């Protein structure tokens, strides 16, 4: 047997499958769409992971990946996050957070990830029971072994951006939808 509700669970109440594509979408419908990548800055081409403005947007399916190759993610379990069909100019699609004068934000890149730079995300169930909706925690380093301080939000540049972000309020609070 298994514990109860000891897994990450999709809008239709069912098990996340390791390795399945989803899309991340916020719980709040005004909030904006899926997950999507945009150039910002001084990139060559899109390499900043953001929200679409767009509600109606699913956006990208996103790879939700744990450590070691179980059926589904265990609660608690650290993950990676990528995407299915990444942007063609980034070398890998797995997410990775970059300091930045604006504070430590989800970003592509443009060459191969050592895992210790994507095995860095964990949801966390929100408080108000059910609906399956999730916070997105970014995991730093102790100095060996992980600590899951830090919760992911949004920053819109002025650009209309709404990147994905380390921020101190409105974390997200996403549910998964098989894609």
Same mark, same amino acid.
């Given at each position: 047997g298994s514990h109860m509700d000891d897994d990450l669970v999709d809008a239709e109440g069912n098990l996340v499958e390791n390795g399945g594509t989803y899309y991340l979408l916020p719980h709040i419908w005004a909030h904006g769409g899926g997950i999507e990548t945009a150039k910002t800055g001084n990139e060559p081409c899109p390499l900043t992971v953001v929200r679409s403005p767009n509600e #109606?947007?699913? =956006? /990208? @399916?996103?790879? $939700? %990946?744990?450590? !070691?190759?179980?059926? !589904? $993610?265990?609660?608690?379990?650290? #993950?990676?996050? =990528? !995407?299915?069909?990444? @942007?063609?100019?980034?070398?890998? @699609?797995?997410?990775? #957070? #970059?300091?930045? @004068?604006?504070?430590?934000?989800? &970003?592509? %890149?443009?060459?191969?990830?050592? /895992? &210790?730079?994507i095995l860095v995300f964990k949801f /966390? &169930? *929100?408080?108000?029971?059910? $609906?399956? *909706?999730?916070?997105?925690?970014?995991?730093?380093?102790? +100095? +060996?072994? *992980?600590k899951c301080d830090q919760y992911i939000g949004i920053h819109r540049d002025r650009n209309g951006n709404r990147r994905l972000v380390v921020t101190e309020e409105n974390p997200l609070e996403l549910v998964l939808l098989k894609a």
């Open positions: #109606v947007s699913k =956006g /990208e @399916p996103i790879r $939700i %990946s744990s450590q !070691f190759r179980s059926l !589904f $993610i265990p609660r608690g379990s650290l #993950v990676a996050l =990528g !995407f299915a069909n990444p @942007p063609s100019c980034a070398a890998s @699609p797995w997410w990775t #957070v #970059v300091d930045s @004068p604006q504070g430590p934000a989800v &970003k592509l %890149s443009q060459q191969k990830l050592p /895992e &210790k730079d /966390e &169930k *929100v408080s108000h029971s059910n $609906i399956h *909706v999730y916070k997105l925690l970014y995991c730093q380093h102790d +100095e +060996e072994d *992980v």
